[model samples]
Target chain A: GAIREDTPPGSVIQYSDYELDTSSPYAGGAAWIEGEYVPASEARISIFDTGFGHSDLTYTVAHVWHGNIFRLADHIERLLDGARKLRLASPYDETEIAEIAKRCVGLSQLREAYVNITLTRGYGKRKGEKDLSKLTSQIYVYAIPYLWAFPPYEQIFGTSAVVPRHVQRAGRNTIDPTIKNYQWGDLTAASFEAKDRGARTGILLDADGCVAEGPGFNVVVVKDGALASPSRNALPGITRKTVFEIAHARGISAELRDVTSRELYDADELMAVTTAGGVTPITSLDGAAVGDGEPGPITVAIRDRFWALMDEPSDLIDTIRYDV
Target chain B: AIREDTPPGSVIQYSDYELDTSSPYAGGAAWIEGEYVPASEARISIFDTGFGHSDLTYTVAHVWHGNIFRLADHIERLLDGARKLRLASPYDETEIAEIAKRCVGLSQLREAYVNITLTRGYGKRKGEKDLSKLTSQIYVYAIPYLWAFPPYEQIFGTSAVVPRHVQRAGRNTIDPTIKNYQWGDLTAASFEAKDRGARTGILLDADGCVAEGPGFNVVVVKDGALASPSRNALPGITRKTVFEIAHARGISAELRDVTSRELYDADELMAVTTAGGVTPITSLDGAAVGDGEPGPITVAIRDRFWALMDEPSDLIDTIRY
Candidate 1:
């Protein structure tokens, strides 16, 4: 069942108070911040780190599904590329990062967990100096129980999305969205926009009036049986990449290019893709139904196939064997 | 004795590799995380939202001839921005101004750059990412003079590129006037300029109006009329000084929407910032601005801007402590 039409707008999920149930079979989560393995609550970094101060950092997150890390190498390569672009000095190479991330998952010892890796511009040689180039960079990793962008119930029947015109995504020229960073002021504001409208989340439009990605997820449109996603002003999401692969394999046409608000508003089916949820259908936009207000067949296929891929021994899967 | 050793409007050249310990300004101090420490020792948690999210507000002013220039103006701007960003600064305006001047005094340098930063401190909630719960911190430090433009640019003028294709983030996104550390757009624009062999770049707003560059405001003078962007730009203290200088000298100044077309065709153009004072833009997008050199008006304004720095004003006297 979906939210009733008579329900008041501006209602919100209790996200702030929604803590992971620590009483699970795997109770305590662990974190590694600046070379120290500490309780997830205690994973602290210096306020001086450029990562925090300047948003001079890049990060990626992957989920553990039955002891396997999905696309581990791709995540590492993207993180390293982001490091190179931000000139973040990381002592850990890609191989080292991979091992550390795997170890984090092993440390968590949970069947299902969320793994986060961050590379920050280091605390500088001297305090109060704003010279970013002179600073070194460090990496941190942690593993905890999976956090959902939307609760499973909302993901199933689909959630409402608001596209507020008052606030938009930062133009690509400001910060390449490809590099994952914590520069989420726009996104945070967008979430508030969604909440104010009683929607589950908000998608942003670029300065040029083209559709950008949502807060942390990517928006995909299924129009006339062809799939499309925004190419510019959005992250080249790993899940989006997986969707493209699935489309090609199924002979379903897909295009990675600009999608306008009009196209999304009139789309036959809409979905939000991210690491947190492989393929989540969106049935409504700005208080209106999309394509009979239900998950379209194409979206369902992609979602089902996405979860099914986790069980297969595909090239994207890197098994983290807890049995060992 | 005249301090003519550094040429007119030229900055003191210091190698980037110079040791902080070797310099006299090494005695500089910083206020970090509620403690006064040597500038070298001031550090915050890497997890502080200020570092992580660039969730902070700050302002910078310089000391000249043992007097802090427009110190109150800078403090007011910092506090105003802090309030706008919901960063509850622990110190009041008086406390902030006192801390800033004390930092400058502790540096023991006749002239130095003073920076005051108010950050959204590490929140009380452990691992909670909510913005409202974050505490705020005030950090103050003073060090050797910083030049926004290099020494050569200060004397001979600098070339700037107009990256018309790359628009600045709109005010609705991050509010550029708040004087925050959000440099992603600025950095990208700078890289574009550097790639084209220019010192810096001017980003156009979404409507194609010229916005300010990183750390400075862009001003254009045509037929002796001074004009600068009134929107999608910082209310720069240096910019205010230029307007003041222009008004006093009877040079017509207008705060309006300045376009790239007007910028390139202007008889004179300049960049104004506290660190660089006022620098002439001799070249715009590789084309000579007017005479291929700093124009007469640009030079006059530059001279007056610097001269006013040394002059004791009411605002200057109150904060010169």
Candidate 2:
């Protein structure tokens, strides 16, 4: 079953009253590998695993806030789909993997956490020269303290970005952005450019000169008070889906379409949609002020509602069982 | 044994056996964190950027006749990739070469495949976002020699195909010269090659120009002269050595823009790699490449390629245990 389904725009039930589990190793995090769960420190995989050797892996990261996992089932669906696409098989089904994730988080007892689930192509005894189907796949599930590209302090002012002139972000032809894979060769280099440009991060453009995305977040431009994100060269982000749907519920328009750099620079307001940090504003680009150098009104409004969605009612939150 | 049998359809379970605590380099040897571990037992943390983001660079050098070939060149290439990726290696060039030699010599493997990797490493502190906070790491391992296309003496030769759809990533995205782990396109092309009943795949760039093959360099011989892709390809140490050999033998070699059409019309083709050595490509997309056998030029190159292992030179690191 999904952690929760259908974002019901009311408040979610938060669970953060329990005492913090400060046990030495468990405080860092917990991970489940193979059949056993261990402290995050002890977690490891072979150096020769194709996941490391050839980047032959796919993963999904779900955020757990106030001891509740948000939109986990959807993440699992995408992971399974990626597995099928990559010919990567797993010993556990979606439900089993979900249970493992929750157990890991439960073990760590992190009120806010970042849960990463990975499936790697294990080195198969490739008796034949090139049979990818023969490789057995491995699964790794770990939950650490929450990660934020723009923490609450930074999010308040909004993100500063550049369109990385030095590099062309990966196009769909090179590495499909639809399936979440770690082909960060391009993404990592883009980050370097962002740093050199004195920007917080980068917003990449594909080979065709269309805005791809930031390293981990999806870019959203508020043109004329309506939300538009790139249809190509960006992950169909789960939070992005929620943002669009929520916008529609409130009679605010949102869409997935071709967003060019020209349109990006000319937008009324800009925000980044991602599971890591929902509804983060992009108030600056290329060191130039975006909408008076502050979070745009629509962006602020959406961010307020987006965070509350975690606490407000509806079926999307699967509360963690810390006692178990 | 570091790697034990796993039940069918199951993953390899965690075991202390993974890092042979007492074994003195059995299956092979690996150097990590300034210490040696059994090759099968070598492991990297799950949280490492190397495993998560492919934020690392590596190079493979081969050992034959109890000597390592072009070890210095491979080290230079690996360091170049590391520098480009902002990964600082804990071991410098001399130290790295010594570790690799130790891994092979101590393991007593005269014929070995040595791989050296420098990863961005994990954050010194969890939840750390600063790139400077990363503790760049290194891993070097040596095992029994591997093969991309076992020598023609063992089999006929490699059968290659340029798949219809997969194009190698452009240099703008992944610098082909940098030894990176981004093989998404290459792996996808492998599936396409398998579907076409070929044993291997040679990737082309977005411009429809011959780029490279996974784990090896693609070289085509036309009119008794050699040509390879000038861009969007790895400056393979083996490929460079082959060019030098060609020039020495009065054979012409030019690095220029090559297309699939050129590959199809070539008099000969071969894969040059540390693991595969000089492997002749006798067929392309099910058609014989010059008589359906290893071409005479390819045969000569393959023989000299191995013979280089025995000749004394600074490039050779002779095994000493």
Candidate 3:
């Protein structure tokens, strides 16, 4: 439940830790529910739970880890953006959500762990009832042991992304596949296709043949010491935001725009990042070797620096609970 | 469950209903499992489940009344159908399967049925999947309580005659025996054919031989024998039973392919199915089918079916157990 990146000597480790009761029925997870903390086993909702019954809109999944949610504000902000776009009437105000988040963490009291939070469209009547007059809206948090870096890699420089055949993705007129909805049967089928062909991940191309991201992870490529990636066709990953901050701080050029699969394979330096791990290098694409087939210096530095910030503990919880 | 269409003088009622327990514990519904959802909660999958889940390419729903409609025959044939398509393992066959009970219960079923379906899945390989990426799963059941036209000779002629496109996907592409999700596309074709002012639509293979109707068996009055398309494209449960009735009545009924252009231009025309029983086609695309009226040969076949249905069967006697 700690950072394992190689860091320069004497760098201040800016992080905190908490030991959660990891029994079944505990709401212990990386993202702490601010107000109500309960063992996940007891964090049960009844069958016929209104949340699962809603078909009006989409949902988002957010997780907290190591008593420090890597990007709570960012995820919530994105949720707000998506909710507004979908025209959903979100229940909790920003201030109330922050307070609830603090209570969730206090209930968790974790030295290090992970919490999973889901924001849903809430329940509605079968006859298009949209009023939220009697809905129970709060953070549903579940925490587990936080782990980083699944295994060792020779540091791949780029990924050989493949075009998914399951209709690329629904056109924007249909339910945008970009929304983090519970209805993911399409991508689930694509995952089987990827597994069948011995590919590590499934890459979805948009209807226009433009590259989308991997299932839950985004695609990032580097070239000539500058970081670049495609825009809007994929989810705006939290870590991707931090990399841009780091790139700007170091005076390195960063750009996000339309990137074709053709541009991706030709990248000089490349890496990938996700909620599971901040940044990891990519080395191959469609069986072709990437530059040096190794991790680039810039990716390593950005990853290490991201780790440095993660080590520091901010009392964001107190800031929330006491902000009256 | 109530029949969507109830005819005049026919009583409509629901009874002995219960809940459907075959719903997936995770995010899923009961119809995909071949059970009924309450009318209040009837829903289909957000995505299609036809790809790999069901062996058949499609399925149809039925409405039964007066004890039950073809209880033993339908179940037995369904089991056989499942076996033919390598999908005999949906549930343990020993006990009444959950879907059977769920269907019975959802109808408040005194004597009726509605079919939820399973369609074809995307192929196993990502690169091989289609651009539409249709998972192709849903529930489609049409139940009719009574006849729209009463008392004897209904509309005597059908103007529609052209057979729709039919590729009997070979043994490798997709087996013809399995029932998959297919009514919507076929219904569209049928509608087009009907709008061409034909009471009935025809289907024929690329070779121009008769296949079947949108949901019925293809039979033509030829050489004094009521002949049907070979069982190749016919699921043949209802079609087979009807032939048995014909044979018992001393009529020669054979199963073989008859070319469409030749069959349509024959002395008589007819179609048969579970619900429609036996319908005589008196005309094809404005061409007359045997004197432009219900022919004597087709009327004989319908008489045999009514005779069989009126007989008391031991099948319903065991349902109480």
Candidate 4:
């Protein structure tokens, strides 16, 4: 149950190979690299280190089922796009990274799990200095049987979100909202406040008062013909995009446009979508009940279709298995 | 010549009663009562110091002239104002007392002008209960000297301007008078202000109200009277005392409201307070304060100012110097 009991917060648990010797436990391990495990607390990145230049570091969490890494190509491409936007030289390219991910799954024997990959901008003294002495790329993969929130998360009815002091999203020109970066203080702080207020996630609204998304998930609302959410101040969630793709393939009108706070309040339905069939219908916002206070029809369809899509991936057909 | 050579970039000097021998000196010096003087060493505050209580402290060169320091009422009241703001009151009051004693010991003149200040709450720790409450404050004073070639007092010289961007967080909002040791970013605006063609930067509030200068007080000329923006900022001792002197001269001295634009385009403009006492502003932000030249009324006030300081106020008795 304690996947990382031995490792500390700052250091990474590296695995030379993904297979873990269950006979002995290495808690607090950040990664399963090569054939051995690595500790997170011992992982070091320079204070001035940055990954995407827009942020200090970049990390990815790849969900795995059976031997297949769910959305492997998508996650890798997203990581590469993030690196390109920030002008950061990644240590491993797509092919090399795919090989590493495959080796991790090969060694760990994890039928279903999550692999965390981190690329840090080597350490430097200031913003523009390109010093590499302190900068290093770090990769981590771990086995998490369940991706849902712990018991407290499920038991809690609905999470409350707050309006924040910072602009919900940086300007598209400053930094693309799509690229995932580690300097997520604005959303993180909002999420922290929401959690403090007894919520599981935060719904950040842009300076223009348009609805953004949950810290790491996209906000979807069903109105009339189909579903819609803000295209501003949010990540173009891969999961949400997949949901839209399914909606379109099934002839459901899925639109991406700015949604005002008023629209969210008046929406017929709402759901938060993330990777690995991570689509949950909203029951409340700011303590008020949303719609009929239950998961909407389209959200369930997207969630199911996403899982089906994962199962059909031929690349993962032989390597991974999904009991679900 | 560097008036204050204590720090590398420091252009002025001052002697405080409390010197933290163990602490580092940068923008200012940390002076605690009876502590050894530390030269340019940065000291971290010990935890356990509670919030809303004054903690670490330092003194700038402007506060160190020998003769200008006999005036303590103005400076003391400013410190007391800071305390009432519920700022951490760590080793501040005591440090001020010791500094007052030291300033007096430095001179035996009839009257002198000095500005001493105290601050609390510093380092990585907010006010807490786990660390030693090692507090620090510093006192500095200076004497006014007569004019010479390019003297300390400039008559109608071009006013150095600074372009300001960072709005001064308000007192009822975010107290700017805490005078903490973490104004490195704030000082960056001063450089920016200078680039904007201003001698020094006059910070503006979110609503465009004239906040204090990056470190000084602000005053404006209207008709024939002198009015200053109130304690919307650090209760600049010099700004307050200058108003006191103005009120003493039968000039209508008012402390109410003034905007940033109003200050830029005043009938006559001059920045006053301790150290730069009633200095004439011929040019501001590269533009003339009024008609691109210092006004006649400014010279009259500066002239009458010294004539009035000839007779010191009673607040001087408690101060040793």
Clashes of each: 14, 8, 64, 102
Model 1 has a DockQ score of 0.34
Tens digits of per-residue lDDT, candidate 2, A23-68, equal: 5466548899767999887888777678878788889999988777
Query: Tens digits of per-residue lDDT for model 3 on B41-156?
Result: 44432112232122232333334433444544555555565454333333433333345444444334334433433333333222123324443333433222223122132224
Model 1: lDDT equals 0.76
Q: Per-residue lDDT of B118-204 in model 4, one digit per residue for the tens?
A: 433333322122123434333343222211112233355436453444555444222455443223223444546555755556666
Candidate 3 regions with alpha-carbon error over 4 angstroms: A1-38, A42-57, A121-141, A147-167, A313-324, B1-96, B99-321
**Least lDDT summed over 10 consecutive residues: which range in candidate 1 chain B?**
B11-20
Q: In candidate 1, how many Å is residue A119 off?
A: 3.9
| lDDT per residue (tens digit) for residues B1-321 in model 1 | 111135543433222222335544344667665666666555565456676566778888887666688888898899888777667888899998888777765566566778888877776533335657777777787766767886567767999999754678778887888887777777677767878998889888878898899778999999889999999899999999899889998989999999888987899889999986889989988888889898888888887766666667764642332
lDDT of 4 at A240: 75
Model 4 docking category: incorrect
Comparing 1 and 4 on DockQ, the stronger one: 1
Model 3 Cα lDDT, one tens digit per residue, A2-105: 22233324433223433334352332322333244554333333112233333223344333443455666666677667666545555676565555555555
lDDT of 1 by residue, A1-324 (tens): 011112123322111121334443323466776676666655656545656545667889887775678998898888888778866667789898888888777656655667888887767655434565677778888776666776666666687898986788887666677788777767767876787798888989987789998988999999999999999989889999999999999999999999988998889999999997568889899989987988789988888788778878988988885432
* Ordering by lDDT: 2, 1, 4, 3
CAPRI grade, predicted model 2:
acceptable
Error of 4 at B293 (Å): 19
Which ranges in model 4 have alpha carbons more than 4 Å from their true place? A1-20, A23-37, A40-55, A101-109, A125-176, A192-198, A314-324, B1-321
Give candidate 3's error at residue A298 in angstroms: 2.4
DockQ scores for all predicted structures: 0.34, 0.47, 0.05, 0.04
lDDT of 2: 0.80
